[PDB]
Amino acid sequence: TRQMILAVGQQGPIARAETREQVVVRLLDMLTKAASRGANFIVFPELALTTFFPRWHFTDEAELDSFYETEMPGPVVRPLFEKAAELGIGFNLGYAELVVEGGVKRRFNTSILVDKSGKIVGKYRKIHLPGHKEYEAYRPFQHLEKRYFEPGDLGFPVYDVDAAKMGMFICNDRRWPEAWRVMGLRGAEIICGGYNTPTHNPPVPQHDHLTSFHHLLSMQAGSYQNGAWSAAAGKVGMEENCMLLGHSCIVAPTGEIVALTTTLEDEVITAAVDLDRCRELREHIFNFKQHRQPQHYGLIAEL
Amino acid sequence: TRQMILAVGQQGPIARAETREQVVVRLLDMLTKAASRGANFIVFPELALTTFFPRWHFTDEAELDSFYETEMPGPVVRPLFEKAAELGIGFNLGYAELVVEGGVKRRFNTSILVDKSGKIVGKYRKIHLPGHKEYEAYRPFQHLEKRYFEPGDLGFPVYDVDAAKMGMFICNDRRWPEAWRVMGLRGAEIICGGYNTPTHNPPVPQHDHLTSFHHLLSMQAGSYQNGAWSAAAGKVGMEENCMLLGHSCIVAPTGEIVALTTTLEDEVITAAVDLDRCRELREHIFNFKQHRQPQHYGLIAEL
Amino acid sequence: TRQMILAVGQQGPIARAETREQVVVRLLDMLTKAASRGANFIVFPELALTTFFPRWHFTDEAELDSFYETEMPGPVVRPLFEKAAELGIGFNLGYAELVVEGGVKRRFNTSILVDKSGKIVGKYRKIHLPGHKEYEAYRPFQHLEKRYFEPGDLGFPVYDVDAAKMGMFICNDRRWPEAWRVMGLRGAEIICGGYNTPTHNPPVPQHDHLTSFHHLLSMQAGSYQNGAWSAAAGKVGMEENCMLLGHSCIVAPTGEIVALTTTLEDEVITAAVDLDRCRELREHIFNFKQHRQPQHYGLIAEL
Amino acid sequence: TRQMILAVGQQGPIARAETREQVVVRLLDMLTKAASRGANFIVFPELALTTFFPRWHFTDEAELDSFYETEMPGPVVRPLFEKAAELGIGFNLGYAELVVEGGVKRRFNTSILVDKSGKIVGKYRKIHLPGHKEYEAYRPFQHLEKRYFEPGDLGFPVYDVDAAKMGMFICNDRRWPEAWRVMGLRGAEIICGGYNTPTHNPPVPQHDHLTSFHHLLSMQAGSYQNGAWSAAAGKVGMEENCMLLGHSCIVAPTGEIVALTTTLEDEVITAAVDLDRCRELREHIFNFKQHRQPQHYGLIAEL
């Protein structure tokens, strides 16, 4: 039938002291609510198991490490996978990943796709890390993602998830046309991910009142120009004195926003998705094989 | 001072029998009014010297050729260049180009940049030709650009126009992130062009009510993602029984629409442009050198 | 809890020859689908049991009368009421009403609210009839609502429907701030209705490309300024050679569009509704008792 | 000719210590630039001669009074009127009005219309005063307009200004459909005013990211529903540690935003205005005489 119901599980703030066990209870509730509304897949936020720690400068490595996952799923997150399999609803979960390879402690801002059987069918690691690497005094709050993570090493893959071709993006990635295009060329039908986007931008505060605008503009344009359904799940609200943007959403291949959250708390939204709708764009106005002229795009791939 | 006033000269319909002399009178009127409002550059539509002939299926080559320019400017168009130099206002003019090489005819959908001294300082040829190739009987009007024009052979260049770096796009090109990105990488501060966009699309009529949405979405996203000012000049209204989309516009590097037309007739709109505004994006959130990861965008350039 | 899930049942075209029995099958399918997605109420379109007959000029009264309901529900529509009661989902149904009172054949463009028990709990009759009364040759298609209906005689009432205060509007009514305000003053928490809105306006065709814009603008502003959730269910698509606007939607008290259709066929959309959310507006920025100054609004009620 | 060019003079922050002389220099600069761009009228912000003092809790009456005008224009403001007459450009100026009647002080948040001859041709006093009445300790900044001003006593008048019918609104007034409707009924062709709108609202912070949305939604709906051109001039930027919303704008009678500011500093925007454009709405879809049903709007005027 190539039909399904897609859901987004927006998260309200996660406190510094809030435990992973408490967070999983919240994730379970939304996954259950989504299933009750007929959803077959639910998108969760970026770094959805803890508070957004990149806002602080750490001096103790042990303390920094505590915010990362060394297993997936571990005993605490396991319940989410079991419930997903029980109710037949897959999900996209974001978390901080720590893996030791060749004597190096590698840190990634990661997301995984789990199918309706509870099996991990794909992983992606954030390639476009926003922010800075060194502590910057002029900022009211830090954004040290470049210091706490290294660029992803998996490229922008597209995976088969319960008969749907899905690609992942994480937060800032959604603002880069290149990320969307690579997955579009790989045939993605659904492009989804999560985000933590403060409504205040220290470097350019004159853009603060445009935060929602820029976020939604990026989702709509990406979907439209690649003929893909998309979804963005945000962790929102006042988290540790920093306001995070709401407006989690689901978008059609036409760029039309078909579902939008209106609260800054845990909230589930859903939308009926017809995977064949992608054809209205990809077989016509954006029929790549018939219209693209790659011989003129070389500069985009130059190092 | 990095400051200027940009204008867009929207054109109402141009009849099949309307002469180039009559069209020049209309173009001169708008160029003069823009200058009176302080503009230093005015953007005109795609194929701005004739009716949109690609809507018909031609069977006579002599008839087809009549809609093309064999020289630029010819005696009839020259007055526009002279007035531009007199008032100190450059312009972007679209037209059908016919070139004869060793007895072989080359056809392009073209646009040129003329500076405030009336000198041609740049050319661009439409790379993404929309529509179909063969005659399709069911359609109320055809769209045969692929038959009447060859894909441009100049790539997506960026030129110096009176101390402003300007890149050109033509109609359908504005829907392709690749076009915008190439010029963004080349340092464009202003990306502009014209269009003829019917509000009805025979193959996908279910998108007719989204014509304005898709047009504006493309302009906003392109500007924002590349931190560039942009402008789109349309030829609009009921032309030869085909309704063409209005909403000509000027957009800031933030994606904000700063000027918009509301009529479907010849109309001039203007906006103050600060070339240093591009930095709010290009030195921060979209600081290419610091954030882009071209090693992972290779597929975009693969033939 | 004051929580519920609201649904909209958009209808694709209804043919001149399509029977009420066939239409009810379609309505039943959507009501069933909505219930499966957890909805407790579903909004159907204006004149949802037949093709939009006001587009034609009738000379035979018997033929005109055939498009009206003399009972509600009659044997053919009864199944919809039974299913609603079975599944616990109320609905808003629009239809043409014919009633003889005091020797006069009264014709109304009507809508009724049916609760989750299948009981009719309220009626409304369209007060703002758009279009004209006499045949007008210059129009490609007629809009004789003023000829086939008389203004409603029930005012703009607000009813208690399963613990929710609901007010009704029909089509054109949504464009009048007075309609929304009267229901807002009566405490409406949900304001809903249906519509048949052609994408072509004979009197002012220069507004054709703004059809979606004007429709959505009206819904968003109405909701925001009255702190009410709202929903608009359209009968859409190409019906008898006349294209009808899509974009059926559900809107939050903040004016945010939380659900939107993307096809021009029978389509169900849903959204979680928190009746207390109305307080964010009605107890603050739009706290009527604290901010309204009726002594200066007299002209609005002058005859 | 029913034609003119309308301008908006957005103001960047005005410091607590910034003198009226310094502010007039800034106002003169914008009025002169607007004239150079062909404008015949320029709209200035609400309380455009001082910092937004209602953000503080005053304990000294002499201090409060210092922010009010006891005459209009006084020697310091006179130069603005003289230049307006010289260049032929009228304006809408907002200021705090202090009147002494029989030894009793009357306080109003006021705006006046000055024609191109420099003559005061109309006055309006803010009717919908937003905010709270008592000091609220938890708030980072107060909003005590209800304490420092009396509700206007002039109603919502419409005046003749150089052959244009103009109505005035002030800040919060733009959110009330009643204000717009009264002036629409009085035949306003242009409805304009200024505003000071913080991007943060202490009691309902969950609406902070919607500040621009609510502002623009109000302007678009008001214009469309009344078939009137409109303009909103804001005093914006970080003023005394409080961020004020930018996005000053000019809107067509169709609800289309034709001009928008993008900076948070003194900025001039302009737009061509055709007074007969109002007819596209007022003689058709919103032809009051033909469509309105005031006999059913009574509740709106009930005290």
From Swiss-Prot, chains A, B, C, D:
Cysteines engaged in disulfide bonds, as pairs: none
Entry annotation: catalytic residues: E46, K126, C171
Catalytic activity: an N-carbamoyl-D-amino acid + H2O + 2 H(+) = a D-alpha-amino acid + NH4(+) + CO2
Domain CN hydrolase: 4-275
Residues passing through the membrane, by range: none
Superkingdom of source: Bacteria
UniProt xrefs under Pfam families: CN_hydrolase (PF00795)
EC number(s) per entry: 3.5.1.77
UniProt keyword Hydrolase, yes or no: yes
Alphabetical keyword list: Hydrolase
Gene Ontology terms, MF aspect: N-carbamoyl-D-amino acid hydrolase activity
CDD domains the UniProt entry points to: DCase (cd07569)
Function comment: The enzyme catalyzes the hydrolysis of N-carbamoyl-D-amino acids to the corresponding which are useful intermediates in the preparation of beta-lactam antibiotics. Industrial production of beta-lactam antibiotics is now being developed using this enzyme.
Protein name: N-carbamoyl-D-amino acid hydrolase
Lineage: Bacteria, Pseudomonadati, Pseudomonadota, Alphaproteobacteria, Hyphomicrobiales
